[PDB]
Structure formats: structure tokens, C-alpha cells
Design an enzyme around this catalytic site. Sequence first.
Site, PDB file in Angstrom:
ATOM      1  N   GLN A 187     -35.193  35.093  34.875  1.00  0.00           N
ATOM      2  CA  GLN A 187     -35.234  33.644  34.730  1.00  0.00           C
ATOM      3  C   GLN A 187     -35.936  33.249  33.429  1.00  0.00           C
ATOM      4  OE1 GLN A 187     -34.116  30.706  34.739  1.00  0.00           O
ATOM      5  NE2 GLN A 187     -34.148  30.392  36.959  1.00  0.00           N
ATOM      6  N   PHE A 188     -35.167  33.202  32.345  1.00  0.00           N
ATOM      7  CA  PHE A 188     -35.733  32.979  31.023  1.00  0.00           C
ATOM      8  C   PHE A 188     -36.356  31.587  30.882  1.00  0.00           C
ATOM      9  CE2 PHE A 188     -31.620  30.966  30.271  1.00  0.00           C
ATOM     10  CZ  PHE A 188     -31.972  29.898  29.472  1.00  0.00           C
ATOM     11  N   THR A 189     -35.880  30.639  31.691  1.00  0.00           N
ATOM     12  CA  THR A 189     -36.356  29.263  31.617  1.00  0.00           C
ATOM     13  C   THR A 189     -37.854  29.139  31.905  1.00  0.00           C
ATOM     14  OG1 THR A 189     -35.875  28.698  33.923  1.00  0.00           O
ATOM     15  CG2 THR A 189     -34.111  28.445  32.331  1.00  0.00           C
TER      16      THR A 189
END
Lengths: 162, 152
Positions: free
Chosen positions: B79-81
Amino acid sequence: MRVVIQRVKGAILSVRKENIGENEKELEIISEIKNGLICFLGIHKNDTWEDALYIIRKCLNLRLWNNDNKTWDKNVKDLNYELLIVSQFTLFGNTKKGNKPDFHLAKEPNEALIFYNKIIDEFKKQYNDDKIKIGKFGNYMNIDVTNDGPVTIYIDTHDINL
Amino acid sequence: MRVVIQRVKGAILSVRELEIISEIKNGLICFLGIHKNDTWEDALYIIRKCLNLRLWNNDNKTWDKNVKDLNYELLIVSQFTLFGNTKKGNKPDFHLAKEPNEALIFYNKIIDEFKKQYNDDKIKIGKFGNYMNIDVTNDGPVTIYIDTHDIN
């Protein structure tokens, strides 16, 4: 203050319901949203109204929805979407030492409730009375969430200078 | 590395007409963000914490049992966010997030270590870099956040 924001196609919040009564013990949905954000909100013991405002501002204004070939473009108000705000003290669970979370930074439940309710009012004042749903503060909850992305956003207000 | 851990009664992951590709019953869903300067030590801390955090009551006791003791499962989603900086505008920007191609290798190493430290059959994943729909049943809820940059 700490918040985890999840982008969702919907969310259904349920609590335990015991008819004492009729000897009936089932889950009942008390809150529900379609598209929008679920925001797990952790309140720190030394939190001020400024921390709340930043969170509310960010939740209401973050451009998290694509829109017509443009990404990270639209906010939850623009699309006329909903917010589900759940208080979540475990976000102040210190797990730095040992494997039992320690919650000494968490605001105590009572002062927290007042503060939390102030936040919910401000959300409504800054958006719309009908777009803001909540859970049952301090109670066990079951939350069916449809994560859309997923898009997960984390904010600790004690990182910013207010 | 940053992670958001949710305690769940179950989770169903689908990818784009959607098809279900991963599913767990009771356990944890872990949204995993990898920082560009992350080392193997950061991964290990996360793995150890995910597998060992005593997030379940074994009754009369609280924060008593962990995910292995109960034979529960984990769903790990990159989950890069989690590295979306929102300090300076309303539009997240994700430059702290590790480049995709290096991230994938790292991420796969993590998944292997999860299995090595628990059980091949207890670890599910999403479709790295793809849009995903995840139906989650939050149980509590119990939400835990960890930034391995806070520790040495």
C-alpha cells in the site's frame, strides 16, 4: 491526533444487540454509507482543537478520487460522498516494547467522548448533516468495509506545526 | 516501513467484472507501505510485530493471544499510499514510496519471510500494483499503526 482514512465503495457498521428480554442476541446495523471515506480517528491526550480542525480539513478536502482522465483529483465533498467516522484509541497503542499494546497516550474515554462529539459536529458544520455517520463510541463494533483501491491515508497531526 | 494492521473476522480480495483471488477468515489484514530507504531490518520488525502482537482476548485476559496462537490468517497488501505526503496541498504526492520494480522484489521477500516465520498456508496476498477491491470485516475494530522509522 492520528487518523487512518480508507477509500470505500461502502461501509456497514454493526453493534451487539441483546434483547434481555426475548433472549435474542444478534448484531444490528446502526450506521451505513455507500461511496466515501471511513476514518478511524485516534485522539491523543494532549490534543487541542487545532489538531481536530486539521484532521477535519484533510478528511473533507483530500483529492482521492480520479475524475475524467485526472487522478487524485476529487474530494469527498465534490462527488457528494459520505464519511463514516469511528473513534479508534488503539491508534495510540504503543507496540515499541513488548507485544502487548500500551495505550498511555490515548485520551481517557470520558474527555474523549466530549472531544469526539465536538469533532462530529464540526464535520457536519463544514460539510452536511446528512453526510456524516458515526459508530457507537466505546462499544464493540463490527464494520463491513468495501475497500476501493485500496487507498489508505495516514495522518499524525503532531507531525505538523499548527 | 509503515503498516496499518486491522483485526478481522475475514477479508475477501478481488481484482479487476471482478474475481476473488484471495480470502481469509479470522486474522489480520496488513496494509504495508515500503519506504525508499527501507532495509531488511525494517521488514523484519514489521513481520515480527504482525505475527506477535497480542490483539485477541483469551478470556478474562486482554491483549492476550496473537495471530499464531489462534491459528489465524494474515492478508498482506502492499500500500504505497501510506507514503502519500499531504502536508502541502490536498493532492497526495508519493515520492517517499519505493519505486515499483524494486518494491515488488522487496515485497516478495517479505511474503516469503512471513511464511518462513509462520506457515505457508496462513499467508495470503493481493495482486501487487493492481487495482483491488477488498471486502473486510473489521472486528472491534482494532487498528494498529507502526512506522519502523520511529525505532532505531
